[PDB]
Every structure is written in C-alpha cells, then in structure tokens.
Symmetry: C3
Subunit: 495 residues, 3 copies
C-alpha cells in the first residue's frame, strides 16, 4: 500500500464529437450548436404580424384587383408573404414596369397608408363608370382595379386631360398609373375617339410620354388588349402632373410610406396561425436559441446563422474511457466534483478528491472559449430575397452565386472552427492531466517512487493532513526527508 | 552493452513541405495536391463533343450568316466554343438586343432542334428572293441570313402582314426576328413603298411595336443601313403573332430547346482534336486526379478546385534526419517496415523492429486526415462565364470582383489548411516518437538507466523473448526485479 | 549551494495580446498591426494631385455648367473628388442617360484633353447665341453649358442639320450631345419652327433617333422644360454623324481619353491641402506602414487592408511573470541578451547567461512568421466605389452585400490568424523553455539532482569552464562520473 494517483473524469456520456484527425470521438461534456428543427407555421415576428397576401401578388394588392383584400386599417407589418405562383395578379393582362424594383422597395417598407389624390367622382369630362371588364370580376360582375380608374370617352368626346397633385405630406408617396393598349384601330376610336393619343406624366425627377402600342396578341384571361402600368415615388413638396388625350389609366389612391425598416417579401405557401417567433423561415419558424441552423437560407428576424451541415457539436470536456488505477489507463467514473483530481490510498484513506484549482481553471477557459467562438460569426453572411425578370438572368445568377458563395465560405468557416478547437479542447484536457501529475511529482521528489501507471508510492508515512499538502502545492520534502531517506535504502538491501 | 533505443523512420526522400513557421522542410512522405499541367487541346467532355463555332459568333450561327455552318444533325453538346473576336457575326450590320442574355441562356442549353415555322415560299404577297446584299456573301454571291427572310415589296405594293404560329410542341422555342433601318426616305419607299411602317409582335407575355429609325451612319461592311434583331422564348401552348406594314425581317426557322443542363460558352482560340477529358479549360484539358489546380479559373466538367498558387504539398510523414543511436539525434535509415520502432542491442540481437501498434495508428489518422481535408473544399467556389455589353460595365466589374473575391478567399483557405495541418502532422510524429519512448520507460522502471540520447541500458539480462515484452506493453518488472535490484548497487560500489 | 537553473525573459512590457482561449495576456514583445489614425486631409497620391470638383458634379464639369471650373491645362489626376450632394450639376434641368456608367468609366481614366470638333461659330444656318437661360447664370447673366451649343432657329427657319466628325486621333473620344424637351407646342414652334423633329446620331456601333417628349412638368431651377443628354465613345478611325430638324443640343468640345489606369471617384466633403500620401480615404489619408486599418473601407492607393476591428496585436515574445529561482515559477527580469537561458550559481559564479543557440532560433521563426502572416492577405478583398440610379436598387444592394460580405470574411480571417498564431507563439515559448531544460538534464544525468522548481543541484564540482559544457551541449558525464558516483552515496548514508 501507501499510494496516490492522478486521474480525470469519466461518466454516463455517449455524445460524440469530431476533430480534423478523428471522427466519432465520445466525450464527457459537449454542446450542440446546430438547430435543425422547425415548427412548420407562419408566425408573427416579436408580436408584429406578417402581411399575408393569400393568392394575390404584390401587383394585384397594390392596384387593387377585385379579388384581393384591401388593407383599410393601414397595418404595419413585420414581413410580407406571397405564394410562389399567385393566382390574382394583373387580372387585366399586361405588364408592370420595374415590378421587381418595386418589390425590392417593399422589402424596406413596413407600413402603407392609402390616400386618395384624384377621387373617382372628379373626372367630370369623361366616363368613369364604364371602364370595367369580364377579365376583372367581383362577385361575377365585370369590374376593375379598385385603385386606378380606367377613363373612357364621354359623349363621343375625350377632352385632353391635364391634372396635378402637390404632395403636401412629409412622407414619400408611391403613385401608380397606367395606359391601355387596344387590339386594333376601331377599338382605339371606340373607347377614346381621338385616334392618336399619349399619356404624359411630369415630376421634378421624372419625364415620360407614353404611347399606345396597338398590336395583335393572343387572348390572356379573355382579352387580346393589354394594360401597362408605371410607378414612381413623389418626394415631399414635389408635385406630379398627368396629361393625356386618351388611353389613360389614372390613379385614384396612392400609398404613403409611413414606416421604413427591416422587412422582406417571403415566398411561401403557408397561411398564418396564432403563433409568434423570433425567427421565421418560409417553411416554418425557428427556436432561435442556438447559434447555427440548417433549416432554410432565407430566415428573417433574430436568427441564428445558416450553415449547410447536418451536425455541429463543440466539445467541452474529456474523452470517455472499466478504467483502473491511474491516468495512463483512462478516466475515473468515481470522480464527480471536478474534471481532474486524485485518489487517497492511505492508512485511513479511500480515495477520490478533485483538484478544483485546475478544474474551474478549465470550466473558465472552455466556457469562455465557447462564447468567444459563437461571437466570431456575429458578422456572418445572411442572405436576402430578391427577384428578377426573364431578361435579368445574368444578374439573377450573379446574385445566386454570390449568396451560395458566402454560405459555402461561412459553412467552411464554422465547421473548421469547431473541428479545430475541438482538437485543441481535448488536447488541453490531456495537458491538464499531464500537468497535474507534474505538480505532484515536482513536490514528492525522493520520498516517492513513480509506478508509471500514473501513481506514486510513498517511501514514508503521509497521513491524511499531508495528502492535502500535495493537493495544496504545499508539501515540503524536508518534513519527511530523513524519514524516507532511510526507508528505501531498506529496499536497496531488503529482500 | 545491453541497450535498446526508440527511433523513427528516415529514407531517400527530398520532397519538401511548408508550415506557418518554417519553409522548405524536407519530409519522408508527402502528397502533392496541386495539378499544374494541361494538354493544350480542346476535347470532348466525357464522350460528348463541344460545339465549335469556328470563326462564327453565336449571333452568326443562330441567324445563319451565309459563312457559318448550320448544324443540320441537331447534335447535343457538352459546351460551346467561340473565338475571342469572331469574324462572322452580323454580316449585315446592326444590333441584336439582349444578346448577352441570350448567350447566358445558351449556357444552360445542350441541344437545339431547328424547325420551320414560316416557310420561305409561303409569303405570296411579297418579294422573298430579292432581299440579299453584297454584305452577306455566299461563294461570292450576294446572299442573306439563312434563318430569317428579308421581305421586300412585290409589284410596288406591300400589303400589311398578320401572321401567327401556335407552338404545339412540348419544348420551349427560341424565335428570332428583326427589322430594317434604311439610310434615308428614298430607300424606305424603294424597298417597302409604305412610307411609315412598324413591326409588331404579340405573345401572351410579350408586347412590342418596332419602328424604323432612319438615320445617317458610316459604312460598316459596306452599308450605312442597319438591321436590328429581337428574340423571345415562346412557351408551350403559347402563340406568337407578327404584324408589319414594312421593314419586317421574318423568322423562317426557330430552335426547339430539347435538352437543358450543364453547359458553357468558352472563349478560346483552339480547334478540336481526337481527344476526350473530364475537365476542359480554354487553354487545354486537365487530368482531373488532383483536388486543386492553377491552370485557368474557367474550367468546366468534373474539375479540381482552382487556386492561385504555384505549389501545394501536404505532409504525410516525418522530417528527414548520418543519424546514430536514438531518437534525440535523428531518424533511422535502417528502419523500413514502419515509421516508429526500436533497435535490439542484445547478447544475440542486432536491431531494428517497428512498433506497428502505433505505426498503422498513424497511417490511419493521416491518410484519413488527407481525404478529410480534400473534401472540406467540396463546396468551394467555381467561376462561371458571362458577358456584358458596353453599357454594362458596373455589373461586369461587380461580377469580376465577386469571382476574384471568392477565388482569393478559397486560395487563402486552401493554403492555410495545408500549412496549418502540415504543422500538426509533423508535430504528431514528434509526439508519437516521444510517446513510444514513455511506453517503454513506464515499463522498465528500475531495471534500466535512461541514457538521455533516447536509449535505455539494462541492469539485468533481457534475452530476445523479453525484448518483445517491452514491444507488447507486457514487460513485468517483477520478472527481473530482484535480479536488477542487486546489480546496480554493484554500480553504486563498483569501480 | 552548487546549482544551475533554466529560465526565460521578463521585462518592462505591459502590452497585451489575445488568443482563442484567453484575453488580455500580457507579453514581453508584441507587434501592433492595425493602423487606426488618419490626418483628416485630402492629399496628392504619390505626388499626383486629385481632381477636386468643388461644388460641381461630374455632369456639371463635363458639360461645362457656367459655375464649374474648366481644366484648360488638361491635367492628369490620381483620383476625382466629388461632394456628396454637389450644388452645380444640370443647371438646366433634365437627365443624363447612363450617367452612372459614365462615372464608372471615369474610375479607369486619369487624363482628358479637351478638343473642339464642331466650333460654335460654324453653324451658319442657325442661331448659336440666343440659346441661354436664367437657369444657367454666369456672373448674373443668362448663360449655358460651355461645352454644348443650344442651337435655335435663324430667321424663323431651321434647316435640317447633317454633320459628321471623323475621329482621326489614336485616342478614344468621349462625345456628349443632348436634346431639348419643351413645355408645350407653342414653345416648340417658337424655338425650332418645325413642329415635328428628331435628333439622330450614327456611329459604326451606335444607332439612335431621339424625339422631343413634350409634357407639363413642375418648375425645377425656374423651368418646366427639360434637357436630355447622351454620350458615347467614338473609337479611333470611327466617325459620328448627327442629323436633326430641331431640338438639337450639339457638342462643341469632346474629351480625348489620353491616360487610362487606376483612378476613382471619391465622395468626400474635404478640400485639398499641401499634403501628399500613399493612401487616401474620404475622411483623410493614412500612414500606410501597417498591414491593416479600420479608418474607412474605401481607401485608394498603396493601402493596408481594411478590417472591421478595434485592436489587432500579434504576439512575438513570452508572457510576463517577483519571479524567483527557476522556470516553473516565472520569468527572469535579470536576463537581458536573449529569451531563454541559464543562471550560474557556482563557487565563483553569480548567474544569468542566455542560450542564444535557441534564442536566435526563435527570433528567426517568429519574425519570419510575422512577415509570412502579413503576406497571407496580399490578395485580400479591396472595395471599390460605384453608384446606381433610383431604379437600380437591387444591384446596388447586391453590390453592397458583396462588399460587406468580403470585408466580414476577411475580418474573420485576420482576427482568427492573429488569435490562432498568438496561441501557437506563446506555446512555442513554453516549449523552448521546457526543451532547454531537457537538453541540460539529458547531459548531467546521475551527476545532478532535479529539484522540481526548474533547477539542478550538482553532486560534483563543475567550475566555470564546465558551466559552459552544459551550455554548449558538450558536458561529458565521464569527466565527473566517478567523482559524483561517490558523493551521493554519501547522501544515502549522510545525516
Ligand atoms: C387560394 O387558392 C386555392 C386554390 O388552390 C383555394 O382553394 C383557396 O381558397 C384560395 N384562397 C384564397 C384566400 O383565395
Ligand atoms: C478562321 O480565320 C482564319 C484567319 O485568321 C482563317 O485562316 C481560317 O481558315 C478561318 N477558319 C474558318 C473555319 O473559317
Ligand atoms: C461650395 O458651397 C458652399 C456652400 O455651403 C460655399 O460656401 C462655398 O464657397 C462653395 N465653394 C465653391 C468652390 O463653389
């Protein structure tokens, strides 16, 4: 007898980590940092609801297609939800110039207030009720975009229109108008008498004369005619003037941009639920407690960072081992209040005491390294939705390559940091156990024989109050010097 | 005598590696991973030939400039080759709107099938044979684009054209038409009588009226007139209708997109050879066995990853050293079947046996680390060709900066991984040799004297069947305890 | 007595470094690499002055707004400075097509030479002096853009203009013209008689007919009319022809691009000073000696690399410690000519000599690692200025995300390299001190007793010429073997 041993923790764990050099390394303690679950619902963002467009496209909502809900309350929103191929858009077929730019402006917008600039009932010189069609039904009736007025000749005359709106508000106004492209020349005369007409609109910053492009087109939604829409932002104190002799599709209502901020247009097929989250993806919301996720690259809100992986586990503690009588062999199930420690084999002792002098010194620098690692990606790339028209394929692909590019880079960065510091964390543990050993043997020098399994045998008596002398770096060799100095020349000439 | 020594490999090698801290570190084993050679030819990709446009530009080929080869067989292709400044393009000078977008669509296209929608002989009301010119020769004759028909007034009349094609195919159709811009008003009447005309074309998704812009231009390829071409993709079940009173350049043939996939437009000056590769660059093909190359950033196919370096060598084994009598001094030329081992100096022994218990334990985790390193770049950035017109310089430069940006990032990533793990690989070797040592000395404790050069001298007799006891971690001190216990108190009072 | 100790440097320093695992680690030697100061002035770049546009926009300068300075000397420039919202632009209101593309061309341009292609006095058939207005004053007079001529009907007639310039120079010419959009039809007749007119311009590569868009606009700078400008680059040996019946704004002077190279348009509010730098940011110039800075992302010239951090310090030497009698405790203030060394406690000795065999071996591989680290970012991303119009928001944001993306990536890269190699540098120091120790104990084997504080006590006499035997790896045990062999069996049976 008369022994003491230097040893490390081992316990129930079967969680596994990876390094650069080995896979599936089981460890005592380990911290998952990759969130991979989601709730499949569409939720409010920190208490602010999304704008759910249902089956309507942004164009349909703004122009007020008869099938789309208006938002009379003028609510603010946290983001906008639009299905992948909405069914309710330009019910009257045509185009909507710079549509994609407008959707991009919607991403920085959180609240519209609709206001009337040119009231439907104020066009005295023109027909303001006939402009409706079988292509824009509202309860089976022919109807039209609620927000623009399709003016039509009155009494076979269409007197040249000039009309202005001075924007006296403090807010930017979104203003939408349009122009009508008939099938043929009879149609042009039938609706607007004047055979040759234009739609001119003037701003301080915007000058545009628009001309009816008459052509022969296939029937879309029942018609071969088309309607082309335009939009502009009228700055505070600026004014806009419209002049047309025909084919004018006149704004009735405009949109005051009353709140700018962090918003988004999310393409998703879900509908809303009584649910709230900090982080919303198109396929559902995320419990944003972890630092990384792989649910979906287009998450919005207070989100963890997207990485293309299926596992991401940090190591925090030792490897896991029975495991008998020293550190050379393995870890001690029997140690509980620490990571590295000792074992009293004494005339009274039984064993198992932890050196928390170096144990909290580890839980200090690892759990300060785990936080410091997470924060190293604070500025990691986050992707952002944008759309592109069929003639913008190159910049679409530029944008796709740029976003996939950064996601790959940051995925590489994350995996490497975890693998690299996992190798450093485990090797630290080895180091501490090896260093605990030396602290002990640097003390009991001649008074003890290293057995090479990780323990020392005493050439003297220690007693229990001395087995803390080695624990407290306070054992003095001279205390038992001459004692032991005798009793292993007794080995030298023993049996 | 009576010795044993712990030692490591050394051999013929003179291959050199680098770390963060040292350059030109010669090593025993090392794996080049940077492919830097190419074959200078243009080859088929995994058995599928490129489309070689010879001296023709994409525009020339599609419109069918008389000098360009048609591809009547409708072959599929692996990529398209176009010279840097092709000589055969718009032989009749003009423009080709959204040309660059069209070339970008060609990059996702692998096979056209040409089909006739409006046969040359079906324009009964117009001259369909006079439209040719000195600017588009075919064997010294005046001629024209084979794929579009330059219709001209018949009998001094040009009756307004309306004509339609319903796309009854399952495939997208590429359709190209154009319009003619004369020098002056006499020219306009001379060819198309009607003084004021248009070219209108209608699709479900496309509405366009085109008007002759008459102006006074310098002679290009002999003419001051110009021709402007347009293109659109007619979706399955859609139809297209053309209406013009003059200046119409009517499609005869359209292109069925029959195979989409991974393709490219490669700018290169080479011509084809009886050659096949897995990876093709503009200056030649690559033997894609390595994971990295520096030949050219625009490689296509099953390619290694492009990095801007001139060397990239992984270390796999020890440093290289004569080298005499222990690990403290250097490695042993005399060891052959392993990386770390021992040396029998015995009453019979001679020496040199490898501890493959820890040698295959290295060839396990290094050759698993070399594969694991290569795969860490599976998702590395790969550049993609695109073109831009003279008014698209900003997005050209955006695209150039984005691609150079990722190449630099991934070059940094590759070099750092190799240097960082090269430092870890060599230091592991040191560790294993130091650890082999301890395994031995943890066994022979009192029975042997460490000489500090890396060897032990025995205070007892071992014999050959004991020199495997230390090799198999199975030497028991008590076996020879009392033996040695005697014979170095014999040193204590020897000479 | 009779001792010797292995020890390391410690000194005045209080500079602190960081690693992955610890912050605020004080060290003996350390190298700041982050430049954070700037001089707040706008300086010449390596002796070449910027073009300071003062309150003029690029458009104002090129067209020659009466308030802007011309640069008659035709100076070359190192970059161009433009205020954020310049006050002197299109004094006559309108638009300037592809303005942003033109500014992007200015970034690769370092020198214009202005030349006259169509002299003001050569329009014999038109009024060339009346075209001025209250909106372009020059000393309180009505005036006009100095570089283009606003031609006006003469004697109530405006004879159709055709006019050409053959570019006989070797240099690309920048040519700017424009066209006038009146308020109403009376205005059109009042200035240009002909009711319906155009401005046509023909190049080999450029075909354009421009038509007056008459509309009713709010007064900008006093007028409701507008002027629209166009630009093109006329290649050497090419010619350009202008044809108009009215509304033509004719070039007088063109700009020969005589020097292309590295340039920039810097948005900044500063004005020039008698100052010169190697690196200029919009808020001031930088003393480009360091490798990294955080002053401003849009620096130009021979600049260090921009990273978003507030500190970036490399470690080069030991940690800093009184510190008494061995390496186990701490470093020695008393060592001066090295980093690791020894201490003579001899019958004559006092102590403190450095092992420069391993000290210069450190100042070799650290100060080769500090250079090698800096150069690892040679190809780091550098941001570049570009501008975008109000309908280019998507590519603006693409470009912003791409640049912020790379800055974040490279910031991550820089911090990690410094933290990672700081951990490697300090741990090397530990290694060297631990290795110096072993070199000594591998020599004095039986002749000395390790005291476990980092020192050895001698069982024999050494003398001063032997205390270099341990220093020069040349101590032979047999020299004092039988001596010591006696005198610690004297301990074995001493007191
Ligand atoms: C949306 O379209 C689907 C058809 O798939 C329909 O069943 C659903 O009721 C529609 N919802 C709204 C709000 O229009
Ligand atoms: C391509 O142009 C070159 C002129 O440099 C000519 O010699 C060669 O024969 C041409 N090849 C084809 C296929 O037109
Ligand atoms: C620029 O504008 C400011 C007005 O803030 C004026 O005081 C200054 O003199 C102007 N400088 C020039 C060169 O026009």
């Amino acid at each position: 007898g008369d022994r003491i041993c230097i040893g490390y923790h081992a316990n129930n764990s079967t969680t596994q980590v990876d390094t650069i050099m080995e896979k599936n390394v089981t460890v005592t303690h380990a911290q998952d940092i990759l969130e991979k679950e989601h709730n499949g619902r569409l939720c409010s963002l920190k208490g602010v609801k999304p704008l759910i467009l249902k089956n309507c496209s942004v164009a349909g909502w703004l122009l007020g297609n008869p099938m789309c809900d208006e938002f009379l309350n003028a609510p603010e929103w946290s983001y906008i939800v639009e299905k992948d191929r909405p069914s309710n858009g330009l019910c009257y077929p045509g185009t909507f110039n710079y549509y994609e730019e407008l959707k991009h402006l919607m991403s920085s917008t959180n609240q519209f207030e609709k206001i009337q600039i040119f009231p439907r009932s104020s066009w005295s010189n023109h027909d303001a009720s006939s402009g409706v069609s079988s292509a824009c039904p509202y309860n089976g009736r022919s109807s039209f975009f609620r927000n623009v007025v399709w003016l039509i000749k009155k009494n076979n005359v269409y007197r040249t229109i000039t009309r202005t709106y001075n924007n006296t508000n403090i807010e930017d106004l979104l203003i939408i108008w349009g122009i009508h492209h008939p099938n043929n020349a009879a149609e042009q005369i039938k609706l607007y008498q004047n055979p040759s007409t234009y739609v001119s609109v003037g701003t301080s910053t915007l000058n545009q004369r628009s001309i009816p492009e008459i052509a022969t087109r296939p029937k879309v939604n029942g018609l071969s005619s088309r309607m082309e829409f335009f939009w502009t932002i009228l700055r505070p104190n600026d004014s806009i003037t419209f002049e047309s002799t025909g084919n004018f599709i006149a704004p009735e209502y405009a949109y005051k941009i009353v709140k700018k901020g962090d918003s988004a247009i999310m393409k998703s097929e879900l509908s809303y639920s009584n649910c709230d989250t900090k982080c919303q993806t198109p396929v559902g919301a995320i419990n944003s407690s972890m630092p990384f996720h792989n649910v979906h690259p287009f998450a919005i809100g207070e989100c963890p960072k997207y990485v293309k992986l299926k596992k991401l586990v940090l190591a925090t503690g030792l490897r896991n081992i029975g495991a008998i009588a020293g550190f050379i062999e393995g870890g001690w199930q029997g140690m509980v209040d620490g990571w590295y420690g000792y074992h009293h084999s004494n005339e009274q002792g039984s064993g198992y005491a932890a050196d928390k002098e170096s144990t909290q010194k580890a839980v200090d620098g690892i759990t300060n390294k785990v936080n410091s690692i997470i924060s190293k990606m604070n500025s990691q790339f986050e992707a952002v939705g944008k759309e592109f028209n069929n003639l913008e394929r190159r910049i679409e692909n530029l944008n796709k390559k740029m976003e996939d590019g950064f996601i790959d880079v940051w995925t590489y960065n994350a995996e490497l940091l975890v693998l690299m510091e996992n190798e450093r964390t485990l090797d630290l543990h080895d180091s501490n156990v090896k260093n605990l050993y030396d602290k002990v043997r640097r003390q009991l020098r001649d008074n003890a024989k290293e057995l090479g399994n990780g323990c020392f045998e005493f050439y003297h008596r220690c007693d229990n109050k001395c087995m803390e002398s080695v624990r407290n770096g306070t054992y003095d060799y001279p205390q038992y010097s001459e004692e032991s100095r005798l009793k292993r020349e007794e080995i030298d000439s023993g049996l």
